[PDB]
Amino acid sequence: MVLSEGEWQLVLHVWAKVEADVAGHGQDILIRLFKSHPETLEKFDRFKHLKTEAEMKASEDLKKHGVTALTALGAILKKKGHHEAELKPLAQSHATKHKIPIKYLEFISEAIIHVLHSRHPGNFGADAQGAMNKALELFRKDIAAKYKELGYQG
Numbered sequence: 001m002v003l004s005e006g007e008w009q010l011v012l013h014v015w016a017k018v019e020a021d022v023a024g025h026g027q028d029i030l031i032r033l034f035k036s037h038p039e040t041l042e043k044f045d046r047f048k049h050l051k052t053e054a055e056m057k058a059s060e061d062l063k064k065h066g067v068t069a070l071t072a073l074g075a076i077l078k079k080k081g082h083h084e085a086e087l088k089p090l091a092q093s094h095a096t097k098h099k100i101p102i103k104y105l106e107f108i109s110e111a112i113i114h115v116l117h118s119r120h121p122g123n124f125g126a127d128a129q130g131a132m133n134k135a136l137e138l139f140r141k142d143i144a145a146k147y148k149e150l151g152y153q154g
């Protein structure tokens with residue numbers, strides 16, 4: 001696919017709001033993913049044992065990870081579709097070290113869209129949500145093609 005510049009604008013405008021507090025958004029998003037789809041928590045050997053949302057909130061490791069993951073996602077979105085390089089090392093570790101199915105990336109995309117909608121309703125109207133979804137669909141589609149070249153899934 002290909003986003004127009006206007007769509008990229010809508011995506012990078014609400015992302016700039018996220019960047020005002022990356023660690024808070026990363027906690028909200030990972031907790032929303034683990035509460036909605038608890039099977040995803042099992043992929044993390046580091047926090048797998050967390051039993052409640054309070055324990056998740058208080059975990060520093062979980063918060064660090066959230067920052068690591070959002071930061072990488074932000075660096076990809078800022079590329080505006082020219083992210084080949086960035087995607088490479090990311091697709092490799094997720095396909096052969098962590099083993100993250102495409103379905104899980106869909107789950108976190110849904111968690112990202114849920115939190116942005118809750119926190120930033122003014123900058124996340126229907127058109128901006130359609131654009132963000134488009135950008136994540138692109139990210140998934142390109143990672144899915146990379147997984148296949150690498151020998152994993154699809």
Ligand code: HEM
Pocket residue numbers: 040041043044045046065068069070072073089090093094098100104105108
């Ligand atoms: C927006 C999508 C995502 C981004 C941008 C992302 C980004 C990252 C980055 C940059 C790292 C550290 C370097 C590396 O290992 O490659 C990481 C590690 C990891 N990610 Fe992902 N990730 C995403 C989605 C997921 C999902 C959906 C899962 C699990 C259901 C997953 C599981 C993990 C695991 C298990 C590690 C290792 C954690 C630890 O050992 O520190 N990732 N991810």
